[PDB]
Structure formats: C-alpha cells, structure tokens
Amino acid sequence: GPGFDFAQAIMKKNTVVARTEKGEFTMLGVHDRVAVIPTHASVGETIYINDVETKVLDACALRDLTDTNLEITIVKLDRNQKFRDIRHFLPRYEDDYNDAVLSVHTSKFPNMYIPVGQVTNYGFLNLGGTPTHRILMYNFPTRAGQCGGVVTTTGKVIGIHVGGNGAQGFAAMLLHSYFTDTQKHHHH
Amino acid sequence: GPGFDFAQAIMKKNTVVARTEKGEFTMLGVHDRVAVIPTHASVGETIYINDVETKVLDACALRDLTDTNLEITIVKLDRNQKFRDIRHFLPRYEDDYNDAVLSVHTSKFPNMYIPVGQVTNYGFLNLGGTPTHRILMYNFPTRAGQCGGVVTTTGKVIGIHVGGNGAQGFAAMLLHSYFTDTQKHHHH
Ligand SMILES: *[C@@H](CC(=O)OCC)[C@H](C[C@@H]1CCNC1=O)NC(=O)OC(C)(C)C
Ligand SMILES: *[C@@H](CC(=O)OCC)[C@H](C[C@@H]1CCNC1=O)NC(=O)OC(C)(C)C
Structure with missing residues (x-):
C-alpha cells in the first residue's frame, strides 16, 4: 500500500518546476532556499522556477571521495519564499x-x-x-x-x-x- | 484527500492496455468480458489487449435519445479471463x-x-x-x-x-x- x-x-x-537550458525538471526544495536537481540539468547562474527567472546563488554538484559523480546538485536560490x-x-x-x-x-x-x-x-x-x-x-x-x-x-x-x-x-x-x-x- | x-x-x-488503429488507450473492464473505451478509438473486429490480438464480439458506440455521441463504446471481448x-x-x-x-x-x-x-x-x-x-x-x-x-x-x-x-x-x-x-x- x-x-x-x-x-x-x-x-x-x-516541489517547484525548474527549467534550465536542458529542459524542465521536477525540483525538490529541502530547507530555507536550498533545493536539489539532477546534475545533468546543468544549472548555470540563473534558472526558472515556476517560470520566474531566479538567481542561482550556489550550485554544488556532489561527488564522493573517489571523485565520482553522485548526480545530485544542491542549489541555493534567490527567492522570497522559504521551503x-x-x-x-x-x-x-x-x-x-x-x-x-x-x-x-x-x-x-x-x-x-x-x-x-x-x-x-x-x-x-x-x-x-x-x-x-x-x-x-x-x-x-x-x-x-x-x-x-x-x-x-x-x-x-x-x-x-x-x-x-x-x-x-x-x-x-x-x-x-x-x-x-x-x-x-x-x-x- | x-x-x-x-x-x-x-x-x-x-484495466488492460487496448490498442486499435488509433493507438493505445487505457481500457476499463466492467464485468464478464465487457469493457469500455472512448468512441474515438474506432474499435473494429479485432483489438490488442495487453498486446494479444483479441476478437471483438460486440462494440456498441453509445448515443443518447437526441442521437448524439456519448463517447462511450462498450466492447465484448473473446478472451478467457473474466473481469x-x-x-x-x-x-x-x-x-x-x-x-x-x-x-x-x-x-x-x-x-x-x-x-x-x-x-x-x-x-x-x-x-x-x-x-x-x-x-x-x-x-x-x-x-x-x-x-x-x-x-x-x-x-x-x-x-x-x-x-x-x-x-x-x-x-x-x-x-x-x-x-x-x-x-x-x-x-x-
Ligand atoms: C530524465 C532527464 C531527461 O529526460 O533528459 C532528456 C535527454 C531522464 C530519465 C530517463 C530517460 C529514459 N528513461 C528515463 O527514466 N534521464 C536522462 O535522460 O539521463 C541522461 C543521463 C541525461 C541520458
Ligand atoms: C486522448 C486520445 C488521444 O491522445 O488521441 C490522439 C489524437 C486525447 C486526450 C486530450 C488530447 C489533448 N488533451 C487531452 O486531455 N483526446 C483526443 O485527442 O480527442 C480527439 C477527439 C481524438 C481530438
């Protein structure tokens, strides 16, 4: 069940809809103005969040201690609302x-x-x-x-x-x- | 909720997957070997049910007493399983x-x-x-x-x-x- x-x-x-140069992705907001998106989205300096252009303040593409892709990118967003x-x-x-x-x-x-x-x-x-x-x-x-x-x-x-x-x-x-x-x- | x-x-x-010349449709089975599908599917004499070619024994494209399309087609299927x-x-x-x-x-x-x-x-x-x-x-x-x-x-x-x-x-x-x-x- x-x-x-x-x-x-x-x-x-x-969740919000995020759109990068690679297309749209479901985006999970985790806390404050911090969210995640798959690393293949190629987050840049700005991103659309529910079609609103939004400054990306930080983007960390996570890798493990073998220096291998984990496919999680953590992003910090310049927006008013907290998750x-x-x-x-x-x-x-x-x-x-x-x-x-x-x-x-x-x-x-x-x-x-x-x-x-x-x-x-x-x-x-x-x-x-x-x-x-x-x-x-x-x-x-x-x-x-x-x-x-x-x-x-x-x-x-x-x-x-x-x-x-x-x-x-x-x-x-x-x-x-x-x-x-x-x-x-x-x-x- | x-x-x-x-x-x-x-x-x-x-439900089963039904496929006609018009493409695939979700198909609801109602009782015995009777199911429904939108009338725009254009059910013929045979149909695929979960990719198995299946004889259509009856297809009734429902209309009301004004002789207007209701978009429900009731189909009777030659198959072993009862819904x-x-x-x-x-x-x-x-x-x-x-x-x-x-x-x-x-x-x-x-x-x-x-x-x-x-x-x-x-x-x-x-x-x-x-x-x-x-x-x-x-x-x-x-x-x-x-x-x-x-x-x-x-x-x-x-x-x-x-x-x-x-x-x-x-x-x-x-x-x-x-x-x-x-x-x-x-x-x-
Ligand atoms: C999600 C992202 C996407 O659709 O990008 C378009 C190229 C993709 C999900 C898988 C595609 C087929 N089935 C899936 O579940 N992921 C994806 O395409 O990964 C890469 C590494 C970009 C090929
Ligand atoms: C379902 C059947 C379909 O996709 O046929 C392909 C032409 C369609 C659902 C709607 C399409 C756009 N949004 C919908 O919810 N129905 C459909 O296309 O209706 C007709 C009458 C065939 C145009």
Missing part, C-alpha cells in the same frame, strides 16, 4: 525500501504519482556515459520528463529520479548529512 | 464530485495516478468536431496518451477520459444502467 498521502504532502509544499524544512524526512544511511512512489511536477505533468514498487541500493551506474555512484533502482519503465521526480516511502524522502533503461528507473540518493548546517571551505 | 487506494484497486484488477464485476461501483445518476483521481494504464505509463480535483457535470462538448453529451469536466491539464483513463472517487467509478483543451480535461460518464443485464433488439 504505497504512501500516496505522504508523497502528495511533499509534492504540494516542497518547509523536510530534512527530518531524509534517511540517515543507504538502504533498500518497499513500495515506493515516484512523483512528478512539471508543466506537462503538474501533479502525477507512479508506484514503482521495490527500491534497491544499486550502486554503480553508467549514467548517459558518466560514471555514477550511490544509485537506487526500481523495476519500472520510467521515461524522459520524469527526471527530478521525488522518490518517497511513508515518512522518508529517499532520492530523485535521474535515469532509466526502458525497463528500470534510477534515482540518486538523498542522505540527511548532505544538508546539515556545517563548516568552512572553498568549494569552487 | 484523493482516494488513491480505491483507484489503485480498480487499476490492478480492472471482476465492478458495476456496483458505478453511479446511478449524473452528479458532481470532489477530489477525483484520473488513472492511466498504457505501455508508456503502466500505472500512473493524477489527482484532478473537482469534477463537474459539464454537459455538451464539441469533442474534436463531434457534438457530445453527458461530459464531466475537471480543471487539470490532461494530455494525449491519457484517453480511457479511469476517473474515480472513493467507492465510485464515474467516467473515462476522452478529451482536453490544454487547461481542462473531459471524461464521458459511466452510469450503472449502461451495463444492466437487459432485453432484446437489433442493434447493428
């Missing part, structure tokens, strides 16, 4: 999951929910020719237009959709420690 | 509804759910140049590929999706009396 109600609460308060803080719904650790929902919020699909079933910690993925780590996999035929879609179970936001091979879909994990209010160094 | 669980139970036991009988979930009368779900089951979207919000008894619609009666309307930007999609609230199957103008979506009603085990006359 997929957590449709939870998915819908997340979509309603915590509801949903960090407490992010998992602490890598995990497998049951009965997940993928939800999309784009111009073409402003509110759509797809039960993808079981989600497994998959690991390595050649993503459009880019070596990528920390991938989650579900046996569902996801399509173009669903990148950035949010993967939830009840009470957890576990990843965002980034790829698919026609039979399976792939999400980059979200972990709680990606967003903890932290320390000082030169990142660009 | 949309009835996602109800929608999912209907999709799981009572779970869901006639008791069909409304008796025309009505307006709250918080409906539209669900799609095609090759491209084998399982997708879209909350469309309020559903109003709309009446007349010029559907792709065909005058049509008994239409339901929802303020949601439905797209090509969603025709045949099932419109539910908890406990009722109220219509199938047939059209849209980019801002609103339109479904043809289903009424309980369309499927009551009835009497004798020449219909073709």
Whole structure:
C-alpha cells in the first residue's frame, strides 16, 4: 500500500518546476532556499522556477571521495519564499525500501504519482556515459520528463529520479548529512 | 484527500492496455468480458489487449435519445479471463464530485495516478468536431496518451477520459444502467 498521502504532502509544499537550458525538471526544495536537481540539468547562474527567472546563488554538484559523480546538485536560490524544512524526512544511511512512489511536477505533468514498487541500493551506474555512484533502482519503465521526480516511502524522502533503461528507473540518493548546517571551505 | 487506494484497486484488477488503429488507450473492464473505451478509438473486429490480438464480439458506440455521441463504446471481448464485476461501483445518476483521481494504464505509463480535483457535470462538448453529451469536466491539464483513463472517487467509478483543451480535461460518464443485464433488439 504505497504512501500516496505522504508523497502528495511533499509534492504540494516542497516541489517547484525548474527549467534550465536542458529542459524542465521536477525540483525538490529541502530547507530555507536550498533545493536539489539532477546534475545533468546543468544549472548555470540563473534558472526558472515556476517560470520566474531566479538567481542561482550556489550550485554544488556532489561527488564522493573517489571523485565520482553522485548526480545530485544542491542549489541555493534567490527567492522570497522559504521551503518547509523536510530534512527530518531524509534517511540517515543507504538502504533498500518497499513500495515506493515516484512523483512528478512539471508543466506537462503538474501533479502525477507512479508506484514503482521495490527500491534497491544499486550502486554503480553508467549514467548517459558518466560514471555514477550511490544509485537506487526500481523495476519500472520510467521515461524522459520524469527526471527530478521525488522518490518517497511513508515518512522518508529517499532520492530523485535521474535515469532509466526502458525497463528500470534510477534515482540518486538523498542522505540527511548532505544538508546539515556545517563548516568552512572553498568549494569552487 | 484523493482516494488513491480505491483507484489503485480498480487499476490492478480492472484495466488492460487496448490498442486499435488509433493507438493505445487505457481500457476499463466492467464485468464478464465487457469493457469500455472512448468512441474515438474506432474499435473494429479485432483489438490488442495487453498486446494479444483479441476478437471483438460486440462494440456498441453509445448515443443518447437526441442521437448524439456519448463517447462511450462498450466492447465484448473473446478472451478467457473474466473481469471482476465492478458495476456496483458505478453511479446511478449524473452528479458532481470532489477530489477525483484520473488513472492511466498504457505501455508508456503502466500505472500512473493524477489527482484532478473537482469534477463537474459539464454537459455538451464539441469533442474534436463531434457534438457530445453527458461530459464531466475537471480543471487539470490532461494530455494525449491519457484517453480511457479511469476517473474515480472513493467507492465510485464515474467516467473515462476522452478529451482536453490544454487547461481542462473531459471524461464521458459511466452510469450503472449502461451495463444492466437487459432485453432484446437489433442493434447493428
Ligand atoms: C530524465 C532527464 C531527461 O529526460 O533528459 C532528456 C535527454 C531522464 C530519465 C530517463 C530517460 C529514459 N528513461 C528515463 O527514466 N534521464 C536522462 O535522460 O539521463 C541522461 C543521463 C541525461 C541520458
Ligand atoms: C486522448 C486520445 C488521444 O491522445 O488521441 C490522439 C489524437 C486525447 C486526450 C486530450 C488530447 C489533448 N488533451 C487531452 O486531455 N483526446 C483526443 O485527442 O480527442 C480527439 C477527439 C481524438 C481530438
């Protein structure tokens, strides 16, 4: 019994449509003015958020300690509204999951929910020719237009959709420690 | 709070993918080997059901007593499996509804759910140049590929999706009396 109600609460308060030179993506807002988007979106210095041109104050394309793409880009946005803080719904650790929902919020699909079933910690993925780590996999035929879609179970936001091979879909994990209010160094 | 669980139970036991010369449509099975599909599908003497070629034993393109298109075609299929009988979930009368779900089951979207919000008894619609009666309307930007999609609230199957103008979506009603085990006359 997929957590449709939870998915819908997340979509309603915590997603916007983002558009870059690469097209539209569902965008999950995490806290304050911080959101995520797949790294293949190629975030620049500005982005459209619900068709409003918006200054990108920071964009961090995450990579692990092997210097490998994680496919998550964290963005800080110059806008007035704060996102509801949903960090407490992010998992602490890598995990497998049951009965997940993928939800999309784009111009073409402003509110759509797809039960993808079981989600497994998959690991390595050649993503459009880019070596990528920390991938989650579900046996569902996801399509173009669903990148950035949010993967939830009840009470957890576990990843965002980034790829698919026609039979399976792939999400980059979200972990709680990606967003903890932290320390000082030169990142660009 | 949309009835996602109800929608999912209907999709799981009572839909198949149907494909005609016009493309793929979600197809709702109602009872025995009787199903529905939008009249614009142009059902012939055979149809594909989950990619299996299937004899169409009867196809009745419903019209009202003004001789106007209702956009429902009832089909009787030569296949082994019986549909779970869901006639008791069909409304008796025309009505307006709250918080409906539209669900799609095609090759491209084998399982997708879209909350469309309020559903109003709309009446007349010029559907792709065909005058049509008994239409339901929802303020949601439905797209090509969603025709045949099932419109539910908890406990009722109220219509199938047939059209849209980019801002609103339109479904043809289903009424309980369309499927009551009835009497004798020449219909073709
Ligand atoms: C989401 C982004 C997209 O559609 O970009 C257009 C090129 C894509 C989702 C998968 C496409 C096929 N099925 C999917 O679930 N991801 C994507 O295209 O990844 C790259 C690496 C850009 C090819
Ligand atoms: C469903 C059938 C379809 O896609 O046929 C391809 C021509 C269509 C749904 C609407 C299209 C735009 N938005 C919709 O919600 N219905 C449709 O195209 O109706 C006709 C009468 C065939 C034009």
